[PDB]
């Protein structure tokens, strides 16, 4: 401090000078007091100097003078009070303006004294968000060296993160495509996990995903997912999990599809919930990505997820919902329903219809067990299993609470799918007989003049398999159905006026 606090107000006429080029020689002569701890220590003392650096170091057109400048500031900023006073130098947005400056080694100060500032200045955000800072970070990250991509994409991450504003500027700024692009052509941990930090940020953002899903960060988030960094896997998965909705039109999954099936074998039960949500909204509506689930062994490695998971329901629900998307509308879903009970699932999915599941579970479960039903080979066991007594149970129930939202879930589902499921199961003798017995005819019949038309087309089916039995046909009639069916004749839905045609002519 002797040299220092005492050779501070020499300084503050040795930083101000008005000479081109004795301003360029005192800057080299501050770079050189910022170099020693004890005059920089006192250049953080007095803000005089300090508003001189910043000042001079926008002023000056020569690439020298803007560095020494530069790296003044970043050794005032390992200093708290030094960040305090670049906030009253005006620094931020003089630091911003060389965002676009070319040298390299003026921008590597400038982005880490902007960054020390977003971590310990309080404000600081707000401040970088006013000088336009955010359009000029995204524009950085065209650069190449990754210790200064890692630095801005961190102060995108710190900005953008409980901020809807900065994330839609990161968006017109081009930024999905930008981190997307970091994903692909770098290797550097530190970078790839902060990337996906700003990625899984975005990831929420209504406007966001369907850019970042567009640029190819589906797949470029699974070419990090065996990576040995766990908080780069689990990143990657949580973006990739928030992004899945809108990646149903996205091709070139096959390596994605094949990783996220090897990672429901893993012992991390976020890992697994991940990829059991991830590939739960990718095989929806996509008949190719169904087909590749299943090519690499998908059905048998979800019902192994499912027996693992147990009462946990944040697990067995995607994969129940994906097993029941792998068994319907796709090539081999005749050998997936099979591969269900090839590997013991029958038992548990039927277990998954009681207590203590919840609705959710249920609604994915019921639906599962219809296309289960579509296999002839699943009948029998389905009936042992006891899923059709609870699957009638389950649709009684939901009728009274209609005639009267549960868990986010609408009873009218219930009625449907239950419905359904037992629709499927009719086709068998044997099941025929069951749901006879449970006196469920009557139900069926109510069920006609449902309000819904899906509704009504279970309830037709139902009684139209049931109707090719003699006894049951005489059941139909004596509970007065002939009535609704004629007017389910006259429907817009076709389904119920074909099932309802049926039945009429059963009953004869």
Request: proline content about 4%; aromatic content about 4%; charged content about 20%.
């Amino acid at each position: 401090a002797e040299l220092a606090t005492r050779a501070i107000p020499e300084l503050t006429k040795l930083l101000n000078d008005e000479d081109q080029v004795v301003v360029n020689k005192a800057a080299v002569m501050v770079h050189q007091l910022s170099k020693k701890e004890a005059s920089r220590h006192a250049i953080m003392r007095s803000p005089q100097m300090v508003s001189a650096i910043v000042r001079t170091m926008q002023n000056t057109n020569d690439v020298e003078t803007a560095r020494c400048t530069a790296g003044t500031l970043h050794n005032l900023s390992h200093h708290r009070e030094g960040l305090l006073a670049i906030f009253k130098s005006g620094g931020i947005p003089a630091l911003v303006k060389m965002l676009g400056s070319p040298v390299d080694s003026v921008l590597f100060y400038a982005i880490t004294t902007l960054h020390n500032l977003l971590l310990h200045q309080e404000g600081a955000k707000m401040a970088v968000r006013l000088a336009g800072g955010l359009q000029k970070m995204v524009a950085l990250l065209n650069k190449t060296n990754v210790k200064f991509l890692a630095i801005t994409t961190d102060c995108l991450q710190i900005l953008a993160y409980g901020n809807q504003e900065s994330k839609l500027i990161i968006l017109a700024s081009g930024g999905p495509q930008a981190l997307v692009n970091i994903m692909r052509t770098y290797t550097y941990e530190k970078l790839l996990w902060t990337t996906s930090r700003v990625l899984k940020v975005l990831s929420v953002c209504s406007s966001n995903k369907p850019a970042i899903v567009e640029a190819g960060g589906m797949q470029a988030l699974g070419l990090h997912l065996t990576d040995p960094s766990q908080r780069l896997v689990q990143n990657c998965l949580w973006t990739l999990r928030n992004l899945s909705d809108a990646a149903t039109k996205q091709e070139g999954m096959e390596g994605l599809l094949g990783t996220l099936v090897q990672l429901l074998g893993s012992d991390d039960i976020n890992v697994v919930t991940c990829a059991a949500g991830i590939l739960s909204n990718l095989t929806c509506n996509n008949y190719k990505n169904k087909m590749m689930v299943c090519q690499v062994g998908g059905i048998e490695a979800l019902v192994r997820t499912v027996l693992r998971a147990g009462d946990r329901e944040d697990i067995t629900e995607p994969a129940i919902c994906a097993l029941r998307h792998l068994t319907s509308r796709h090539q081999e879903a005749e050998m997936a329903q099979n591969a269900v009970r090839l590997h013991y699932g029958l038992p548990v999915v039927v277990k998954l219809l009681h207590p203590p599941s919840h609705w959710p579970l249920i609604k994915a479960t019921v639906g599962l067990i219809r296309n289960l039903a579509l296999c002839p080979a699943n009948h029998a066991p389905l009936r042992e299993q006891g899923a059709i007594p609870r699957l009638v149970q389950l649709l009684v129930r939901a009728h009274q609470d209609t005639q009267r939202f549960v868990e986010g879930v609408r009873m009218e589902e219930i009625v449907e799918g239950c419905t359904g499921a037992l629709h499927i199961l009719a086709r068998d003798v044997h099941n025929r007989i069951v749901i006879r017995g449970l006196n469920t005819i009557p139900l069926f019949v109510q069920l006609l003049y449902s309000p819904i038309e899906n509704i009504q087309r279970v309830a037709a089916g139902v009684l139209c398999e049931l109707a090719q039995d003699k006894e049951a046909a005489e059941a139909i009639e004596a509970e007065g159905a002939t009535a609704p069916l004629t007017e389910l004749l006259h429907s817009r839905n076709e389904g119920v006026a074909t099932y309802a045609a049926a039945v009429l002519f059963r009953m004869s």
